[PDB]
């Protein structure tokens, strides 16, 4: 029922922190992304990940970082985690130089491609837009696709919100939850609380009003086959 967590390493955690962007993409500066990445760094390090942060990567560095990571020997790791902070549109995230498909960055870890992670959880956390909608509010052969979880900061087709001074909503929320419960709650409970916290605690403040008092809900996709606790 639980993923076996007995290995000498929890595992590798890659953080790609894209703040910058070549003019030819005309994407703005993602202010606040540094507080994000540092909070994430501290959390995932507390969990026990070996964390490395790569700044303003480009599409090819990203491809390569993850291809190379998929290529290491994970035999003594429980799991693998990768966190992407960047601009995005549906199905696709931004490098500094353009957009690359998320499917590609994650396929490297398909069980047929990173065997030492077979039957082990692979986690992706993605803070990025996923298109251009706003939310107004109201009131044993294993499958090669098995054992992934994508925790997205927002639902397909939608924007995703970031406060220059505090960070993205998804990351602030994920980090407070992890600080408090990373070691005692199963991954879906944690992500469920984050879903709750993003929905209740934030509302876009803005001029434009086309952008004023908007809401967000994150989106968890799980192909996990067991429950995942970070300790014992």
């Amino acid at each position: 029922y639980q993923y076996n967590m007995n290995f000498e390493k929890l595992g590798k955690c890659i953080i790609i922190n894209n703040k910058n962007f070549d003019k030819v993409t005309g994407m703005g500066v993602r202010n606040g992304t540094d507080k994000d990445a540092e909070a994430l760094f501290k959390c995932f390090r507390s969990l026990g990940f070996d964390v490395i942060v790569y700044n303003d990567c480009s599409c090819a560095k990203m491809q390569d970082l993850l291809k190379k990571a998929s290529e290491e020997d994970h035999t003594n790791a429980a799991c693998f985690a990768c966190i992407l902070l960047s601009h995005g549109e549906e199905n696709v995230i931004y490098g500094k130089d353009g957009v690359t498909p998320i499917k590609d960055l994650t396929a490297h870890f398909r069980g047929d491609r990173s065997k030492t992670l077979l039957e082990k959880p692979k986690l992706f956390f993605i803070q990025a837009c996923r298109g251009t909608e706003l939310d107004d509010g109201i009131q044993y052969k294993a499958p090669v696709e098995a054992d992934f979880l994508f925790a997205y900061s927002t639902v397909p087709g939608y924007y995703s919100w970031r406060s220059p001074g505090r960070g993205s909503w998804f990351v602030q929320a994920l980090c407070s939850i992890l600080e408090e419960h990373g070691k005692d709650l199963e991954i879906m409970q944690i992500l469920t609380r984050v879903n709750d916290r993003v929905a209740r605690h934030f509302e876009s403040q803005s001029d434009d009003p086309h952008f004023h008092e908007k809401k967000q809900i994150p989106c968890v996709v799980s192909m996990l086959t067991k429950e995942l606790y970070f300790s014992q």
Partner: peptide, 4 residues
Amino acid sequence: DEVX
């Protein structure tokens, strides 16, 4: 607040 800015969007991504």
